[PDB]
Symmetry: D2
Subunit: 110 residues, 4 copies
């Protein structure tokens, strides 16, 4: 199992650097597996480095509220959580974020 994220700032058309991202797993609420920060190219390649994982519900929380605060920009979102389910645990999963101040998009990248 590999989990990658990358954030794209839609206001600038450039990647969003230094954004905190929290990875969680749904247990019998949610529990932290890892916490990372997006690099110069707005990426966290191994979130989650290549290791075996149990299937089930996962979550990434993009700390984008703190990101816009440091730029002195207003935003609709205090943070952006993305819930996803993994049944094929062998695969590399990309969960990108297309970030605007008052809107966003996310998907399997794959």
């Amino acid at each position: 199992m590999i989990l990658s994220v990358h954030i794209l700032d839609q206001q600038t058309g450039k990647p969003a650097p230094g954004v905190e991202v929290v990875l969680e797993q749904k247990k019998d609420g949610w529990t932290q597996l890892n916490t990372g920060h997006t690099d110069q190219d707005g990426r966290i390649k191994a979130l989650w480095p290549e290791k075996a994982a149990a299937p089930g519900d996962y979550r990434v929380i993009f700390k984008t509220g703190q990101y816009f605060e440091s730029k002195k920009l207003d935003t609709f979102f205090p943070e952006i959580p993305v819930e996803f389910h993994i049944s094929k645990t062998n695969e590399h999963y990309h969960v990108p974020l297309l970030l605007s101040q008052y809107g966003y998009s996310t998907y399997r990248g794959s």
Copy 2:
């Protein structure tokens, strides 16, 4: 304060009906204010009917996992949470969801 949501199925180009949506407020974790289901036109007009509200972080959870399950369709998301912050509590807030099986978009509508 007014809170509305509407879901648009991107596979069909038609609204997504009968989808459960849970509205929550961040307290000193999260607490349910109301639970609704999208109508024939994929809307929940008053989520949250017109009443005074305290500023702070809110959340809507679109139960889209159960939606695709009833259509016998696979999806990346077990559900879709959307976190948002309200500072101007006088306003009508639209939080629409553009729904695909393995991707989505959300925004202030406004």
Copy 3:
């Protein structure tokens, strides 16, 4: 046949007013049916007012380059064209635009 558009500024979370939109039909290249400008609520309700229409390929061009220029903002797009096909000419068609400086989304609204 009814054709509506509305533009949502993702930087502000408010509708985008005064944006020129050109409606075209594919002929044996493209030909202008109508030209409108988005109102205070970022809408052009009747683009295209309620009248019978021939099925086929249509196009709306959102003059968003001129929009950002008047705000002194840079953008990736000189304008945003959206091609769509209508087979059911009886229906009301919404073609909304979720507008960021360096990214956008469009869909049937319906």
Copy 4:
């Protein structure tokens, strides 16, 4: 100047292969610079291979209508054109497409 595109099928969460993409430049209408087809990973890495280019308005046309037709799926779009402007001709430009049947997203990737 480098121009890359990649298409992501939002219905499947996998890249969209074998999709024709036409690259054009705005002249004193539009003129074809190159035509490519997306590979197994839904990419056209060099659209446009690394060569010097003149600044101005460009266009990529994603032949997504023909794509869904071969899958026997209905779609709102006969094809998807994306207009973009390049002022810094030294840079590598990614223009990805997040593809659903009745909706899509595009952006600088960068």
